[PDB]
Amino acid sequence: HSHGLFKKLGIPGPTPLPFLGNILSYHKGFAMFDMEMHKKYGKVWGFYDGQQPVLAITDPDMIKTVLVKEAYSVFTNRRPFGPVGFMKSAISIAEDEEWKRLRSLLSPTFTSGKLKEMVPIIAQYGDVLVRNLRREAETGKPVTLKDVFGAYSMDVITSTSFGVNIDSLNNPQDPFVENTKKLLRFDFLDPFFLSITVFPFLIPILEVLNITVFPREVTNFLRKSVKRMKESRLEDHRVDFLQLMIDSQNSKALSDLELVAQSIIFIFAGYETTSSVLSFIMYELATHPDVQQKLQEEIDAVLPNKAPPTYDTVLQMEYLDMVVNETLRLFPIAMRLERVAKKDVEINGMFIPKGVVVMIPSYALHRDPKYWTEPEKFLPERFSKKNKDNIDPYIYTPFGSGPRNCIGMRFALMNMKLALIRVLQNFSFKPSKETQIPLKLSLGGLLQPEKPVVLKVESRD
Amino acid sequence: HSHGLFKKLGIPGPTPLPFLGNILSYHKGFAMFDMEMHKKYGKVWGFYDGQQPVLAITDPDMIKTVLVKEAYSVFTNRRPFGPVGFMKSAISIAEDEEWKRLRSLLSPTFTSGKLKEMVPIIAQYGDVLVRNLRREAETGKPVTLKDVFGAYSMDVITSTSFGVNIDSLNNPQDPFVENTKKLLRFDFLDPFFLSITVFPFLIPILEVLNITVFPREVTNFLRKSVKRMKESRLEDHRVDFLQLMIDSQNSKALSDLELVAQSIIFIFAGYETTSSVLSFIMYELATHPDVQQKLQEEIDAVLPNKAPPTYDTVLQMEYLDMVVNETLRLFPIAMRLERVAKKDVEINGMFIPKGVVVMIPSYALHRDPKYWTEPEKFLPERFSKKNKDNIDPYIYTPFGSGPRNCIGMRFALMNMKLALIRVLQNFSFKPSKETQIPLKLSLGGLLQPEKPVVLKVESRD
Ligand code: HEM
Ligand code: HEM
Numbered sequence: 002h003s004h005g006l007f008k009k010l011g012i013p014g015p016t017p018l019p020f021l022g023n024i025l026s027y028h029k030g031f032a033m034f035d036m037e038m039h040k041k042y043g044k045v046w047g048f049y050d051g052q053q054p055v056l057a058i059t060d061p062d063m064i065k066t067v068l069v070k071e072a073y074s075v076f077t078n079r080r081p082f083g084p085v086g087f088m089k090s091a092i093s094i095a096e097d098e099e100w101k102r103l104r105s106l107l108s109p110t111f112t113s114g115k116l117k118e119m120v121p122i123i124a125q126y127g128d129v130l131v132r133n134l135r136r137e138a139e140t141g142k143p144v145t146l147k148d149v150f151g152a153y154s155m156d157v158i159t160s161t162s163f164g165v166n167i168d169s170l171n172n173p174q175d176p177f178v179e180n181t182k183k184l185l186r187f188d189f190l191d192p193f194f195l196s197i198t199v200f201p202f203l204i205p206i207l208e209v210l211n212i213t214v215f216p217r218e219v220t221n222f223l224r225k226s227v228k229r230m231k232e233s234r235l236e237d238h239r240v241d242f243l244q245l246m247i248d249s250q251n252s253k254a255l256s257d258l259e260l261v262a263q264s265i266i267f268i269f270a271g272y273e274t275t276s277s278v279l280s281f282i283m284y285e286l287a288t289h290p291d292v293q294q295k296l297q298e299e300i301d302a303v304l305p306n307k308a309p310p311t312y313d314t315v316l317q318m319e320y321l322d323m324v325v326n327e328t329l330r331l332f333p334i335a336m337r338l339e340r341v342a343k344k345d346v347e348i349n350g351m352f353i354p355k356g357v358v359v360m361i362p363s364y365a366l367h368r369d370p371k372y373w374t375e376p377e378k379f380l381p382e383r384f385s386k387k388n389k390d391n392i393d394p395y396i397y398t399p400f401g402s403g404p405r406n407c408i409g410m411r412f413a414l415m416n417m418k419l420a421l422i423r424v425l426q427n428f429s430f431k432p433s434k435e436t437q438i439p440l441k442l443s444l445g446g447l448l449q450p451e452k453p454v455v456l457k458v459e460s461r462d
Numbered sequence: 463h464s465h466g467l468f469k470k471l472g473i474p475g476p477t478p479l480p481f482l483g484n485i486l487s488y489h490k491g492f493a494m495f496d497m498e499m500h501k502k503y504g505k506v507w508g509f510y511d512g513q514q515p516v517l518a519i520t521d522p523d524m525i526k527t528v529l530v531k532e533a534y535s536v537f538t539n540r541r542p543f544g545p546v547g548f549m550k551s552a553i554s555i556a557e558d559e560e561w562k563r564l565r566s567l568l569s570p571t572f573t574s575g576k577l578k579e580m581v582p583i584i585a586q587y588g589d590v591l592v593r594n595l596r597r598e599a600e601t602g603k604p605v606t607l608k609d610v611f612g613a614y615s616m617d618v619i620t621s622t623s624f625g626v627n628i629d630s631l632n633n634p635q636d637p638f639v640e641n642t643k644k645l646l647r648f649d650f651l652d653p654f655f656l657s658i659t660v661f662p663f664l665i666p667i668l669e670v671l672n673i674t675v676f677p678r679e680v681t682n683f684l685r686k687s688v689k690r691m692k693e694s695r696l697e698d699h700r701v702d703f704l705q706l707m708i709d710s711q712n713s714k715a716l717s718d719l720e721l722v723a724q725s726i727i728f729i730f731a732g733y734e735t736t737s738s739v740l741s742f743i744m745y746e747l748a749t750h751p752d753v754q755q756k757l758q759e760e761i762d763a764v765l766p767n768k769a770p771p772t773y774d775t776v777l778q779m780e781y782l783d784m785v786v787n788e789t790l791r792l793f794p795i796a797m798r799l800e801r802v803a804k805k806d807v808e809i810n811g812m813f814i815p816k817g818v819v820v821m822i823p824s825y826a827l828h829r830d831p832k833y834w835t836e837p838e839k840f841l842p843e844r845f846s847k848k849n850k851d852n853i854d855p856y857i858y859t860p861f862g863s864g865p866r867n868c869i870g871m872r873f874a875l876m877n878m879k880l881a882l883i884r885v886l887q888n889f890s891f892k893p894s895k896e897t898q899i900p901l902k903l904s905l906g907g908l909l910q911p912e913k914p915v916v917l918k919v920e921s922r923d
């Protein structure tokens with residue numbers, strides 16, 4: 002009955018099927034689906050994830066109304082996502098007043114003073130990463146980036162969050178390593194999540210039985226592990242997220258269960274994200290020696306003879322920033338952004354009923370010919386001081402936008418840049434024979450390459 | 463995963479869809495679906511009602527193996543049908559040893575001695591039907607057959623079962639009339655039954671909450687009504703099903719709840735069936751004056767000057783029997799017959815795994831060009847002594863076949879014939895302007911005409 006909504010409002014889209022709505026259209030993944038629909042329906046289309054109506058918008062003004070203008074009043078929350086348990090209190094899952102409160106309590110965590118203080122910790126692991134990478138370089142076997150960057154992502158996360166200093170790559174069997182690395186982003190296209198989309202009525206049944214998409218084993222270890230590194234350990238001032246969160250309950254307020262839910266979500270949100278992007282960047286660099294050479298030239302020029310990177314020097318590297326940005330354009334890992342209309346609204350011309358998920362298809366927008374010349378091409382120059390004025394911040398949205406944008410944006414940029422600097426100071430990266438060209442994306446619900454990125458690593462003396 | 467079954471066995475059929483299986487193919491009803499599939503897959507095809515695999519067979523030998531040969535050992539039961547409650551003990555729904563026991567206890571009910579004893583009761587209402595029909599005839603407004611035959615069906619059922627003598631047509635507000643006539647055959651194509659097919663896992667949930675497809679209001683009235691006409695009434699020897707059922711517990715055995723479940727199922731099975739067929743017969747007769755004239759000539763010849771029909775005279779009317787049979791050929795109301803394989807089996811060449819519903823598509827078989835010359839044509843002669851040897855009893859199956867065939871077959875034939883005799887002794891039937899020609903069947907899950915049959919009635923003096 003909800004399947005006549007877009008018909009009633011006179012909005013075009015793919016004709017839904019009883020029960021399934023439009024989900025069979027996901028056979029080629031989210032990105033493709035969004036590309037095809039944009040191409041054939043233009044600026045706005047409507048579709049159904051089961052019985053849930055989703056309105057895709059592509060108009061920059063419209064997008065700002067949703068993400069910025071009407072955030073607090075109408076578009077405050079993401080779609081509710083499944084059986085969730087105690088993780089319901091995680092910032093990214095929280096709603097309305099719960100969210101606003103957690104956002105407030107957690108903002109001061111990601112400030113530049115706190116961030117500049119985090120530099121010497123996250124640098125210590127630029128060194129470890131080099132060390133590991135060279136061990137593969139002088140033995141000379143084509144490297145798997147996700148493995149080495151994955152290892153790197155975790156090391157910085159553990160240490161910056163809790164202070165659990167561990168070489169995850171060489172310690173694969175470490176109890177903290179086994180738990181955390183299980184925490185991977187959800188494929189909303191897998192069988193179980195498709196079942197939840199078609200039968201959302203089953204969610205409360207799952208919630209009552211303490212079933213939750215976050216593996217109970219993982220969340221338990223940490224649940225009572227954080228308990229040790231507060232009461233058994235830190236009960237006596239260190240530089241990490243946990244402290245910044247401990248002292249914050251020490252004046253609002255923050256319960257014990259909430260605090261762990263945030264610690265978990267910083268990993269789940271932070272871990273695969275940082276390493277997928279760092280892996281995509283290297284791919285482009287390896288397939289574009291000119292851009293790599295030039296980046297290495299900017300790095301040696303700024304930090305001569307392998308000087309260590311600092312907060313101020315990172316911000317000073319223009320081409321570095323251009324390369325990170327162009328990569329995010331091609332591979333914005335979120336693919337889509339989403340808000341639910343709490344109430345009925347009329348955004349710039351069109352009426353949107355309560356409960357409709359309004360979706361911004363970031364990937365299709367990033368690769369749109371009507372905003373981007375040769376948008377399949379990797380062209381850092383797009384982002385140079387001269388060109389980067391012709392870039393709409395609501396067409397280009399790798400970190401979302403508005404009050405509910407990526408909270409860890411600054412931290413993530415900084416982290417990746419530091420990783421990239423140390424690595425490029427010591428090594429060059431070249432295509433192996435197993436390297437797939439062009440790169441192919443997983444037809445799954447995740448923006449990742451269909452085969453893992455394998456690259457040849459060579460020292461620079 | 464069950465959707466690769468027919469692929470694995472190398473059996474052809476329509477490719478199923480995730481979850482839905484093949485149910486969208488029912489958009490034109492059961493009969494059409496079965497016709498199309500036969501035409502395009504030949505002798506055997508496989509399809510999925512949701513996740514339930516159904517094997518259609520059309521080979522007469524094969525059909526006899528299922529319906530007759532392997533009934534007791536392998537093909538004992540129909541598919542389980544939904545939330546059912548106390549009606550689980552109704553003969554037509556019962557399984558294995560429960561069924562075999564009820565079949566036994568109820569066989570002696572439908573014998574010809576009992577049946578010949580039922581004649582004077584069921585005749586009393588041939589008279590009532592004439593009386594009502596004439597009231598419409600001399601006022602001269604085109605009659606709706608279902609209404610008058612419906613009324614007739616019930617009158618004979620109530621009286622033959624319980625002894626509740628009521629002119630249902632002129633007593634539409636009678637408390638026994640309002641209850642019973644709500645009891646109509648299930649449309650397995652309506653929304654609720656489609657939901658149960660796609661989510662059969664919900665059935666036990668429904669059963670626990672005492673939800674049941676037989677309306678609780680209806681089943682309750684009778685439940686405690688039968689209680690009155692046993693203890694308050696018959697506790698003191700009459701000719702009816704109830705008695706035949708009362709004395710049978712008076713020697714195996716029969717519980718109180720069972721007895722009512724059978725009383726209900728004789729109505730639900732008997733009521734719409736008798737009147738749908740009686741309505742289809744009149745349609746053919748009205749659209750074929752030659753056949754009507756001839757039938758009336760056989761009736762006057764056997765029962766001169768309006769003599770009342772008897773058991774022996776009914777059996778004596780060949781053309782009558784030919785007309786009833788030809789109509790059932792065109793409109794076998796069951797459309798399909800079904801058995802579930804209790805275990806794995808290998809019927810004459812092909813292997814059939816446990817749980818597969820094996821289905822005989824009676825309607826398509828009745829209208830098959832390879833067994834029937836001009837099978838769309840209404841040609842009683844098909845069934846004359848000379849031709850009726852060329853008729854396979856497993857191609858032609860209006861009352862099913864084997865140990866689980868229609869238990870009320872003899873009673874139903876007799877009842878319809880008596881109705882037809884009295885009616886044709888007094889009246890002729892002619893097409894109105896609202897009469898649709900040719901007749902169109904409901905695209906629903908029931909074999910009924912898309913518009914109700916309206917015919918002009920005229921006295922014969
Ligand atoms: C390349 C790396 C990263 C990318 C591309 C990324 C991207 C995004 C995007 C697109 C959103 C959606 C915001 C919206 O709805 O508009 C988001 C939200 C979020 N990100 Fe990130 N992110 C990254 C790294 C991180 C890290 C390292 C953290 C934690 C330290 C983090 C924590 C979050 C949180 C908590 C939210 C939800 C904020 C809220 O709803 O209140 N992210 N991110
Ligand atoms: C024109 C009228 C009727 C037709 C065409 C008809 C047809 C059928 C058919 C095709 C079956 C399926 C048997 C099988 O699976 O092979 C059946 C079963 C049955 N019929 Fe009828 N029927 C009619 C009237 C009646 C009446 C009047 C009664 C009750 C007095 C009745 C009671 C039953 C019962 C109880 C079964 C199930 C037997 C069992 O499973 O043990 N039917 N009928």
Ligand SMILES: CC(C)C[C@H]1C(=O)N2CCC[C@H]2[C@]2(O)O[C@](NC(=O)[C@@H]3C=C4c5cccc6[nH]c(Br)c(c56)C[C@H]4N(C)C3)(C(C)C)C(=O)N12
Nearest residue numbers: 050079081082083093094186189198270274335337338339
């Ligand atoms: C999933 C939550 C718990 C994690 C949170 C987070 O903390 N992240 C930070 C970096 C990445 C980001 C996140 O994973 O990615 C985010 N979003 C998602 O993962 C979106 C959420 C979806 C979803 C949730 C529940 C039921 C569903 N049925 C279907 Br079909 C989908 C779906 C599609 C799916 N879309 C397209 C992606 C944003 C960037 C938009 C998100 O909210 N993330």
Ligand SMILES: CC(C)C[C@H]1C(=O)N2CCC[C@H]2[C@]2(O)O[C@](NC(=O)[C@@H]3C=C4c5cccc6[nH]c(Br)c(c56)C[C@H]4N(C)C3)(C(C)C)C(=O)N12
Nearest residue numbers: 511540542543544554555647650659731735796798799800
């Ligand atoms: C339904 C039961 C309780 C009544 C019993 C009966 O007592 N009848 C006597 C005369 C008619 C006959 C009956 O109604 O008709 C019978 N059969 C049916 O009504 C069949 C049963 C079906 C069914 C049951 C449960 C779930 C389902 N999902 C789907 Br898709 C279907 C379905 C299709 C449907 N088919 C094709 C018809 C026979 C003649 C075959 C039957 O068993 N009847």
